[PDB]
Amino acid sequence: TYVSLADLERAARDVLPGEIFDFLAGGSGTEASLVANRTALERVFVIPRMLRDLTDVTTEIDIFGRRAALPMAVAPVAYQRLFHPEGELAVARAARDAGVPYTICTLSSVSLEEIAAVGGRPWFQLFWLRDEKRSLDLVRRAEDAGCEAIVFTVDVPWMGRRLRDMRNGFALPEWVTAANFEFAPATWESVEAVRAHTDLPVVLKGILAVEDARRAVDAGAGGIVVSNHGGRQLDGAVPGIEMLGEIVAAVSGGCEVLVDGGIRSGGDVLKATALGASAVLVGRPVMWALAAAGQDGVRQLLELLAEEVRDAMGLAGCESVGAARRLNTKLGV
Amino acid sequence: TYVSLADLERAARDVLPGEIFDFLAGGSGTEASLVANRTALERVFVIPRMLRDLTDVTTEIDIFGRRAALPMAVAPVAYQRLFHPEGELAVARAARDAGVPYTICTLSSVSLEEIAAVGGRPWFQLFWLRDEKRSLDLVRRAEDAGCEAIVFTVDVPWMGRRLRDMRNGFALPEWVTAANFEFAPATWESVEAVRAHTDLPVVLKGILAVEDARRAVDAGAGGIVVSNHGGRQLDGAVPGIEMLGEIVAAVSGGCEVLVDGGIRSGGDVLKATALGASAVLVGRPVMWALAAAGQDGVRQLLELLAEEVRDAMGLAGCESVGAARRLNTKLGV
Amino acid sequence: TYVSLADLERAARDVLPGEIFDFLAGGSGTEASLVANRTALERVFVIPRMLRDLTDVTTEIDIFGRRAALPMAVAPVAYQRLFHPEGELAVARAARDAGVPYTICTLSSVSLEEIAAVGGRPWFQLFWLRDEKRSLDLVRRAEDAGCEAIVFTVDVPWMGRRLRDMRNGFALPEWVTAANFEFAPATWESVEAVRAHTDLPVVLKGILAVEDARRAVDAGAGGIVVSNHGGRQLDGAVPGIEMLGEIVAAVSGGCEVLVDGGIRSGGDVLKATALGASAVLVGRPVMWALAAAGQDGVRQLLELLAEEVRDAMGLAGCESVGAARRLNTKLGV
Amino acid sequence: TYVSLADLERAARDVLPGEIFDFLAGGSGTEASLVANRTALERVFVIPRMLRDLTDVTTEIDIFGRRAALPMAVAPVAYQRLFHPEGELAVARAARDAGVPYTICTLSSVSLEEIAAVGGRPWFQLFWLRDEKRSLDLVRRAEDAGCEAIVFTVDVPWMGRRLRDMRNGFALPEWVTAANFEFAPATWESVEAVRAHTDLPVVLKGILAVEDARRAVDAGAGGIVVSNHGGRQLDGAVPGIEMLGEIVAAVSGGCEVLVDGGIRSGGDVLKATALGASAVLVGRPVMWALAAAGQDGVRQLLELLAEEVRDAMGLAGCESVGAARRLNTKLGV
Ligand SMILES: Cc1cc2nc3c(=O)[nH]c(=O)nc-3n(C[C@H](O)[C@H](O)[C@H](O)COP(=O)(O)O)c2cc1C
Ligand SMILES: Cc1cc2nc3c(=O)[nH]c(=O)nc-3n(C[C@H](O)[C@H](O)[C@H](O)COP(=O)(O)O)c2cc1C
Ligand SMILES: Cc1cc2nc3c(=O)[nH]c(=O)nc-3n(C[C@H](O)[C@H](O)[C@H](O)COP(=O)(O)O)c2cc1C
Ligand SMILES: Cc1cc2nc3c(=O)[nH]c(=O)nc-3n(C[C@H](O)[C@H](O)[C@H](O)COP(=O)(O)O)c2cc1C
Ligand SMILES: O=C(O)[C@H](O)c1ccccc1
Ligand SMILES: O=C(O)[C@H](O)c1ccccc1
Ligand SMILES: O=C(O)[C@H](O)c1ccccc1
Ligand SMILES: O=C(O)[C@H](O)c1ccccc1
């Protein structure tokens, strides 16, 4: 019986080999951006409203044309067989059963078509390939398999310097492969190529500058994820949570604005919402639950987050996620 | 001989069973709001005035039609027999003898009429019942018994997630019951129902948004308590002390504005006053004193707070609480 | 060989009885204001100037009609025989030989006339007596003995709550007495009585509010000391260093503006100067040096501070204290 | 295999005698400015840009008429034979081979002409001599030997109070001497004397006030180094990184603006650039690498910094250093 997301991190550290726990936990460089994601959420306080009608509190949203049960999706995390033998299929099944979107990775350890067959209306995360037309082929595979959005990762012209991985000499076990199969830096040209090749909404993940948010709308994106890649890319990149309010104001409803990095409770989901997010992504905690207890672990985590989101919303006087977006906040110490 | 309120916490931790100390000490979630209540007071500094007439320093106030000896009341705390066998009666007697108002709880472990019979002009705290007309019956019982104000708790549509209690598996001992006897969320409609059913002042406890303070005045409240429920309700709710000055300015004398959360000395009372509070509530420390030494413990705590309030006021150049409200403050680190 | 003021605190803690070290070190209440005095100085950074003429760097000032060797005086500290058998006479002799003013206390453990006979042009600190005309008699004694200024302490309507002293049960040894011999709160009337009874400059020690600084000038004060009494009076009083710049601007040269609280190096003297102080007082460190090594200890401390002040000034491009007052500062973390 | 600059500090502490490690690591006074250099960088976050062309990322700059491989030079550090027997020659050879400028010190432990003979287009750091025409003789020696800029240190009218050195009784071993051979404070007159005696660019190192930056341009400087001398001069001097943006704006392209103090990664170089620096100096880390492994150690450090700078730039969307200067930043906690 886990009563917070931190109970699951403790359980995952017990089970996983050290080097795999480090691949999961780590960030780039000195891990300043990884720590700052948590700092930034901890400094945000909500100003709750009282005495509102809570007869029919709902945590549901509509996004990219589908109803979701919570304002949350599972973030793209590569190589989930590292954490549990059922890898992506375990997490995808749990997500489906919880009504939350699951992002299938370009570097998934089970093929995208197998994970899409689980059901649950899935999203697909794209890394740009050096071999471009292979890029558009992954996108078409994803669309043919029933994925509902293309989450184009735009913060990885190459992978950051993960010092834990270097120190550990980490490499994929022989038994974990990139099951969908040397990548190139993406540009605004790449975005347009993808937009022209699909009818699915294109979501740019890894935007932090206001002007890049605005350009994303101008480029025809359906959404952005305001994100420093969990502190795994530029060490010293600002947390997404610190940019979110400014970005929300700048796009002024022109696309969905998601945030990630450090979300560890339903109260953090409420903070993100109050700052203007349409939804959040959650990465590491979903992998902790997978490592600890497989599919059932992920189910328990999603049930716990659902309960915490509903609790937080109602304590704050919000019968709907839209009401939560109208909450005010105060930055503390 | 206790020389600070912290001496009493040490004494209560020694005597109480762990799970009961945790019920008392704990907050919701990660306990961020519980910690922030203390942080927020610690960052406030007073700018004292010198060379004023202190011939007749008085700590008295008039509130809800009665003189009180200090700008303080005992906060509503449920189930006080958990802490000492004499429970509410011990605290109520001490409060009476100190000249400070005592708030009788809807979840008192001794009936409201027994505690009111102690004397001391008492207040009554209301939780809204799912069974509404039972709500108005508790209010009428309280008024018939001589309570002087109705403290309507508006921040508990349901109880928060108290992880210490969950982890401990805490439940009331068989020997502690809700002696006044399934509740429902309160709304502004509920407030009006209460206001129409009583001539007593209605005080809304748990207001943090400025606009809710203003609506409270418009709704005919006689007072509000600016409060995050001691960090026991929404985890991430702003401390009341951080909202107080803004709220005081917004109501511009339309009702009494009390604050609670983390008050642990007469100097903290002075801070609250300087920020504009009419009075404060004190919760946990009163229970520490009750656990440590029963009625006499609570008497000692009230005498110590009285001394500290008078000391602080005079060192700050204030012959009256109104003068203290005109002090300026500076936020530090 | 002491190379910083902190070397002397270590030496004094070794020698003094615990309860006497606590009388010296302690503050009121939770000691928040005592800690904040240090915090506040630590957050101030100087913006030094380069490439100025330093041929004739001088640390001298003119104050209350006399040249002083440094922009520093020894603060009033009661009962110096607590620290060393030669008490006040040891400190006064050292101060004389260093060219810095020494403040003789109303609660000195050697009579004011004996300490004045040491020489060095001394100041006299006044506590207002309940018996008023005795007040004016102490002032006249001081003036007859050759004191050069009356430092009227205005922040002690009564003594603060020193919890270390309470816990230790501290009291003066039989062998330490108030050698100049039930006091009353001072008012603006008291200030005028003193001003009318002496031709010496009257300096009000313990001013923190801007308006009290202004009133001090209007009342004919020759100086003020911006001070929270070393955190020994109101617990939660703002540090003087945090008020200084505002106060300096408000009096706009109408009286000398001194500061105290936490000065522990020549660099801290430079900070105080840059914020606009005419001079600083130093309390605890002078007593550490007295406890450690008597007169010679105090001499060593004054020589070390002189060296640090001259070093700091010159590294900052300041050939005179007036130049140091024109330095700019930046508040950091 | 070192994967961060901190790996080299650990290696140098193992090898060097304590008193020599302290000479290198220490600062003046309480070491507040030394610590603040790190604090200040840690509070700066970069707002990276995405989706830019990174086909030809280059870390090169043009400065003082020469191409440099990175926006970095080796800071002047006296007496490098303290750290390794090959001293300056080892560091100069490494710097040459990495394409980065090396600053030859007036207090070098190998003569300036020997170090210049290594090649690599070197700079020369000047301390003003009490014997002035000797000053201009060092400058002419440097120019005759092929140095490309005169880095005039303007923050050392005399050496600061290094308490570690005092406590250790540190002095140069007999086997380390000032191989180029009682100095005097420099003034603006001295700057002009140097400017009139050389055609090389004159760079003033140790400027922190905005007005001194402006005067430097007016005086004909080719550059300034915004610097508190690694916290070794005035204890309480503001970090250069906290002044940099203001200074850059004030000179508005009138000279090159370099910064130093606490640069410990390529990400810190990116921060400095984003705040407007033309280039940085790096001191202590270069000496750590020299102590640990001599010339090859310094080569490894420069290769690691090159990799980190290129990584940071590209993750931030910058194909050139000029693009990096146009990045925005956000100050965090
Ligand atoms: C082990 C690991 C692998 C990841 N792999 C990818 C990836 O393949 N694609 C991607 O866009 N983001 C990837 N991310 C980043 C996440 O999508 C997400 O931005 C980050 O984990 C969110 O922060 P959180 O983990 O603090 O919730 C990865 C994160 C982790 C921890
Ligand atoms: C054990 C406990 C029980 C409480 N029960 C109630 C309650 O029944 N009604 C209510 O309005 N507040 C209740 N509160 C909140 C207090 O009235 C008050 O808002 C909070 O304790 C104030 O903070 P302090 O304890 O830091 O002084 C309770 C608090 C505690 C600690
Ligand atoms: C042991 C002790 C006794 C003091 N006695 C007096 C006093 O008799 N009169 C007075 O005006 N201030 C008194 N003070 C306050 C000092 O004058 C001064 O304001 C404070 O010590 C300055 O701070 P510092 O000790 O941090 O330098 C006393 C301080 C100490 C520590
Ligand atoms: C051991 C040591 C010796 C130094 N000697 C000189 C010097 O002779 N001339 C000079 O201008 N700066 C000198 N400096 C200061 C550096 O040039 C530089 O400003 C400072 O080291 C930069 O900070 P960093 O060490 O944090 O990178 C010295 C620094 C150290 C640590
Ligand atoms: O952090 C991630 O996205 C994941 O570890 C990853 C995989 C491949 C390239 C860069 C990064
Ligand atoms: O915190 C309190 O008010 C107290 O523990 C309580 C009792 C009943 C419901 C919610 C909360
Ligand atoms: O702090 C001081 O001034 C000193 O301890 C003191 C002495 C007498 C009354 C109040 C205070
Ligand atoms: O810090 C330095 O510049 C170096 O230690 C130094 C050498 C000579 C005088 C002052 C300072």
Residue numbers in the entry:
A (entry chain A), B (entry chain A), C (entry chain A), D (entry chain A): 2 to 182, 205 to 356
Reproduce text from the manuscript describing this model.
A single mutant, Y128F, that extends the two-electron oxidation reaction to a four-electron oxidative decarboxylation reaction was unexpectedly observed. The enantiopreference for substrates is for (S)-conformers, as (R)-mandelate was left unchanged. The spatial arrangement of the substrate (S)-mandelate and the cofactor FMN in the crystal structures of Hmo favors the HT mechanism, because the distance between the N∊ atom of His252 and α-OH (2.5 Å) is shorter than that between the N∊ atom and C′α (3.0 Å). Crystals soaked with the inhibitors (S)-2-phenylpropionate or (R)-mandelate also show a similar distance (3.1 Å) between N∊ and C′α as that for (S)-mandelate but are devoid of reactivity [Fig. 4(f), Supplementary Fig. S9].
